[PDB]
A paper describes a structure:
They comprise one of the catalytic α-subunits RalGAPα1 (RGα1) in the RalGAP1 complex or RalGAPα2 (RGα2) in the RalGAP2 complex, and a common regulatory β-subunit (RGβ)11–13. The GAP domain of RGβ lacks the catalytic asparagine residue and is thus not active, but RalGAP complexes require the conserved asparagine of the GAP domain of the RGα subunits for activity. The RalGAP (GTPase activating protein) complexes are negative regulators of the Ral GTPases and thus crucial components that counteract oncogenic Ras signaling.
Here, we present a cryo-EM structure of RalGAP that reveals an extended 58 nm tetrameric architecture comprising two heterodimers of the RalGAPα and RalGAPβ subunits. Already at the initial steps of image processing, it became evident that the 58 nm elongated particles consist of two identical subcomplexes, which are, however, flexibly linked to each other. The resolution of the focused maps was 4.4 Å at the hinge region between the two “half-mustaches”, 3.8 Å for the central region of the RGα2/RGβ heterodimer, and 3.9 Å for the peripheral region at the tip of the complex. However, the reconstruction includes a portion of a second RGβ subunit of the adjacent “half-mustache”, which allowed us to unambiguously model the N-terminal portion of the second RGβ subunit and a small part of the second RGα2 subunit. The SD domains are the central organizing module of the RalGAP complex and mediate heterodimerization of RGα2 and RGβ in a tail-to-tail fashion, resulting in an overall arch-like shape of the RalGAP heterodimer. These loops reach over from RGα2 to RGβ and from RGβ to RGα2, respectively, thereby linking the subunits with each other and accounting for one-third of the heterodimer interface (buried surface RGα2-RGβ: 10,443 Å2, RGα2-RGβhug: 3923 Å2, RGα2hug-RGβ: 3574 Å2). However, the RGβ hug domain makes extensive contacts with RGα2, in particular the long hug helix that runs alongside the HEAT and GAP domains and holds them together. Unexpectedly, the structure reveals homodimerization of RGβ via its N-terminal region at the central interface between the two half-particles.
Residue numbers in the entry:
A (entry chain C): 17 to 65
B (entry chain B): 17 to 356, 428 to 461, 507 to 657
The structure:
Amino acid sequence: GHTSVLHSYPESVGREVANAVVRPLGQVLGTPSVAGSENLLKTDKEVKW
Amino acid sequence: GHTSVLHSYPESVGREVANAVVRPLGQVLGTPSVAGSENLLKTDKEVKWTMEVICYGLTLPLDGETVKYCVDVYTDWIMALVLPKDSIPLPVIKEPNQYVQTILKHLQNLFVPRQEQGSSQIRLCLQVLRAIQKLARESSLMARETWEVLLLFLLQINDILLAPPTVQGGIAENLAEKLIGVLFEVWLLACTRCFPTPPYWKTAKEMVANWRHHPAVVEQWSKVICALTSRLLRFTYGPSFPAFKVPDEDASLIPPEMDNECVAQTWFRFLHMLSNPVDLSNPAIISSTPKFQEQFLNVSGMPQELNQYPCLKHLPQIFFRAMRGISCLVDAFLGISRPREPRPLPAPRRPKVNSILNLFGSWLFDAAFVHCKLDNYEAGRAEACGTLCRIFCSKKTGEEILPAYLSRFYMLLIQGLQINDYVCHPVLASVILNSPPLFCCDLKGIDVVVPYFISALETILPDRELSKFKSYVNPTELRRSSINILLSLLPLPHHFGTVKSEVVLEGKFSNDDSSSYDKPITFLS
């Protein structure tokens, strides 16, 4: 179960995708604020992706 | 269902991840000279992830080759239905229907017009259109659900690219012909085998009524209905009946696999597919679509935008083209295959005049009278009784005609033949030219309109060169028709003499100024 979907693709584009997709999540999680943005994910497909 | 999962993320990061995914995958699958390479997709989760990430890429602007790779891999993937390819992943071949349905759902976002990349957008759109066209033309066996999805996708993209008002230099102007042609071709192919359900017919009829301001729509409809009616009359009567002429390409639009019984239903449904062509005469009705109403909210400039839109200047030509098409259809039904140049004699196997009136005359009568009440759409009005005027003269001898049709035709003839102030040269010339044997066909009560014809001829025969009519019809042919009409009325006085002729005084219709309107005029005068 530890296998990754992005493994088949080249490593450079894989790491580009990884950083580009995790940077906004890390920014949102850090520096908590009173305002509620309703997170970013809403449905099962989004959280699965 | 076409919304991409990646839309939640900000635009910049989404563009970056889409480009990063599409660069190697596109450069491998889309680019040629990649035979023998193992597929990068092996599992259903893999292919679903890839499909979603590629689907988000369409919304991105066409800058760079990312959109080119996306459309190329889409065209390669959709071609898997026609024939399997090495680059196609194995799970795609295993379950093709659902995957191609999802791809077609994703392709809807591509056709959305963009800001300034139309130079490449036109090429990409035509490539996708021809890819789908060849996909459906040589399609393998597939479930009717895929056909329904394809038809809905075509209707949706046509609605996206046609409903808004036409702006000069836009993509819609250059792509309307291709869109309508591919829509009609795919619809005919679907009716060949699937025969889509009545709800789809209703949806198409409702959607197509909003694209009547594009000149290509009426032309394509006319061509396809001419092909269908030629195919129908090819077997409705038999080889004895004259064959309707039709271009080879238009005859090739319909496939020969259709059985005789199925042709009638699709012919009727396509004949009524477009709304009443008389609607094109009214400019307010055309400029009342829901998109136009939404556009009317954005309308804040000239107050005459209800009748001065950029795309409302082509209405007279579109109406004339529709009237020409319906006139050609009526001529094919009647037996006058050639134009009007001599006109061949009507075939002995032609249907009764009342049936032709029931089938077509309602549209013809409405089109004639709507411009009778209205020099803007004169060509359509002239063609209207071109057709009508010609229909009645082809009646078989001793054939009964329903009196309502005769009354309507007589009213039309009275309205057309006016000289005082309500004179229109094209319709008058058409009425005179189209009906030489009008009086000779022993029409019941035709003698009532005799004084109007006498008054009309007094303003054409004494004229030397017919300057007013020389820009619409050939003066020599018009003179010949006038002579034929006059020569058929000379025996009437001496034959009748003192017999009174009824007068119909419903307003300022009579041309005489003798203050004897309430008096049946005898032929002696």
